[PDB]
């Protein structure tokens, strides 16, 4: 049943329909079986495309909304549709977060899995941060910061600095610091320390972890260059 | 102190890829001037830099180098006031006469060598454009060089020119290798061979500009037709047209070189010949 | 580095290998390299076919006495531009040809008719020609400054989306030109004008019979115009007629490069003959490291392909337009900090 | 207001969300008023994207179904997914057809509108024809052929050879001939005649619509080269 469901998730991924994949993996992990590496990777990518389609839609609608704030009534419809997209964006994230708190995070019997799921939770509260405004923004960014710090401590304690998941966690932590927490200096410092602690020990990567690790390093390169100031 | 409104054109002295030169009259002093109009569009600060580096030309005075009155920017063009030359450039006399007799060829070559040596030693200013159209002769017989690269920024600005038909560049400059006054010596030699024979002697007795560059880069240098010139002139053009700058001789060898001292020793009344062939 | 993932392109997309219509294929997430499933075999990663259906959609001359020539504006490779007031502000170019050959004149008449048939928003109008003041042509006057003057002498500051839409408008104009079987020889920034401040107007297109000198009743078939924007294959002139769509693509690529760097190519070489020799032999190319840091990879890739040394590898202008519009649509998404992308989700 | 749904659908278009665009366009055409040039294109594009996503999904699922070649339940679940996306596809096609023959084709005074709607009808019946095999295949094939012929007559009579609608109808009808009816000879004949007629009036390509026209011409060329080999 679980193997059938993961095969269905792969098929839905190859078929470009991600909502079916998201539902299939969600009800894969609702059962309560130990989530292996490929399963949790499929879950993360499924929810990532599902959330990212609507996230890009939200970016587009906000950008087209802020072309000229002093305009006609049409902007009201634009903001109403943006609020509708958020209403169709916050609840999906909420589903992922509840799935993490109820099932994923609790039965995590591997420190790599634990830091991966905590990075997931921080990521999804970070996604909630942009759509949230006012005190709700502060409340959601508190959860994202706590999840990120908890992931950071275990990543230091258990994993290597060159581990691709650890590098991704550091990258996402820096993105969280200067996109919401508006701490460009601290975010750049975090990116630089992750970078130099990673390149201080090179040519020791696993053959499978060759493309991904260097890909995250190049992403860190661009982000540092983008906000060197 | 030079302005656009102070000058009016009498006729057209010449034309080329760089620009067009007109004869104008200076009201304060009452002498006819050759005003070169080169069209170029660069930054105002670059305009000031070009004017400043052209102001170096005030002290570049020699009997074998054309003088300099003043340079100014009127409208999108760098107008350079030069000492008007009556006998034009050697290109006009090549158009008029079938070929330059070897004596006046020696005279112009020694004039070029002396002037460019003067420039190298007293100003270290690179000519870079030794061409038959860039060397001028007078009715009285004076031969002076013109249009040399005092302003490197002017060179950079003029780099965006249009494609020409013929070239007088040494093979080392086209390849981008190190270039010295040796390249100017090559260019002078190629110009001399241009003068001696009656045509552009890249295909020695309808050819693309890039094809000409390929000819002068990947083929042996041309040689003048034997039997109608002296052996000294032949060895002069052979030594001047050497692909490798190392084996080619520098200015010190040119000054002592045999064809040079033989040309200097002889006295030729070429002013009258020139006045007959251009009048 | 290619993050190839299956993607069904719902917009106007063209394969980057076969340069044909692409509707299902694989797209790289970080740059945007796209290709067909069947093209995978012939794909040089460098970071069963079904018939294609319908994609988604959405006075003979001028008399000289009628014109009045105002103060001279400037000079160029083959003409001198003057201000005119013939039915409004116009531009009159006095061609350098003094005594046109009768065959040359007939060919020029054919070409001026061909250019008169065209009418597009992104190009300057071609009104007609005159014969009294030697050989002259009349084009639409653009009160706006040239793109070359904007970039270098005036140094007008432009944000990156403005640069992108300028490139888009130029590509639209040249796509229209190539649609009418017109090879815009002599294409450079001095011929691009920022009308009304931002709108791109392309001028001085065609006119092969006038730009090239005539050695009697036959065309010389010699290069003419600025060296920096000239294509390698037309600089070489190993063929009688190397002017094609790909030479225009290379010229547009040089324009793109100087747009995305703010400076002319081969800035370290300051002599025209050396530039001719190196570009002809392939020794010199517009170095991309000068491109702006904030430049999207897609623009860097596009300007890289547009200036390809081999003629056949240069993409046609419909492809260039499609890539530019795709980048314009992707601009709002990627205009912020980047995070962890999808990992190794590649097929086969 | 009916315009409100119009630029709501347009905003969903630039937001990449085509399911809301499809529903908005459906509601707009439900009002029983004649569509403008922009709204008709918007509706056609919206449903084109909606059916195209499912068509690509169906092609992929059928390709794995033919690729596994084993003895298990994997092919059974692949067939289940295929039939699910197939019934979803049929629902979309029947919805757009019911819109077509009840609000669009019956109310089409402009002949070019009639050609567009008949071309859409033939396209959608072809879509059902390539997914439905059996006794019901012949009926939908006949409906698509009849709609294509009805569009063909009007395009030949009162439509220019270089019009994008006429060239697109010719391309779609030739694809119908080659794929559905498996006859390459008459498909090549029709496509050749269309291309030659387009080449004859080549100079008639205005600035308002030239890119699409030459795009169709190039696609016709590619289709000819594919068929003749
Ligand atoms: N002082 C002067 N007196 C008389 N004629 C002159 C004077 N200065 C320049 N000219 C003429 O104007 C022309 C200007 O062209 P130059 O720039 O000197 O050389 P050129 O022929 O343009 O070489 P290229 O390769 O075309 S740039 C000369 O060739 C002469 O014919
Ligand atoms: N339609 C126009 N409207 C306004 N200024 C123009 C127009 N066409 C040319 N100019 C100006 O004329 C000068 C350029 O002269 P041109 O002879 O066109 O040289 P060019 O721009 O190098 O193009 P060519 O001749 O095709 S090599 C510049 O000052 C331009 O801004
Ligand atoms: O004009 C030039 N070369 O000619 C070919 C195309 O113009 C020329 C080229 C480079 C240069 C650098 N600084 C001045 N430069 C020139 N001008 C010039 C130089 C010396 C004198 I005395 C008088 C002049 F007008
Ligand atoms: Zn890539
Ligand atoms: Zn392809």
Author numbering:
A (entry chain D), D (entry chain C): 2 to 230
B (entry chain B): 62 to 266, 307 to 380
C (entry chain A): 138 to 184, 254 to 264, 341 to 629, 661
Please give sentences taken from the publication describing this entry.
The CRD is nestled in the cradle of the 14-3-3 dimer, where it contacts both protomers of the 14-3-3, both phosphoserine segments, and the C-lobe of the CRAF kinase domain. Arg156 in the CRD, introduced with the Gln156Arg substitution, is positioned to form a salt-bridge with mutant Glu587 in the kinase domain as predicted. The CRAF kinase domain exhibits a characteristic “C-helix-out” inactive conformation and is oriented with its active site facing away from the 14-3-3, where it is closely juxtaposed with MEK1. MEK1 also adopts its characteristic inactive conformation as expected. Structure-based superposition aligned on RAF reveals that MEK1 is rotated by approximately 5° in the CRAF structure, but in a manner that maintains key interactions with the CRAF kinase domain.
CRAF (RAF1) is one of three RAF-family kinases that initiate MAP kinase signaling in response to activated RAS and is essential for oncogenic signaling from mutant KRAS. Like BRAF, CRAF is regulated by 14-3-3 engagement and by intramolecular autoinhibitory interactions of its N-terminal regulatory region. These structures reveal a fully autoinhibited conformation analogous to that observed for BRAF and two “open monomer” states in which the inhibitory interactions of the CRD and 14-3-3 dimer are released or rearranged, but the kinase domain remains inactive.
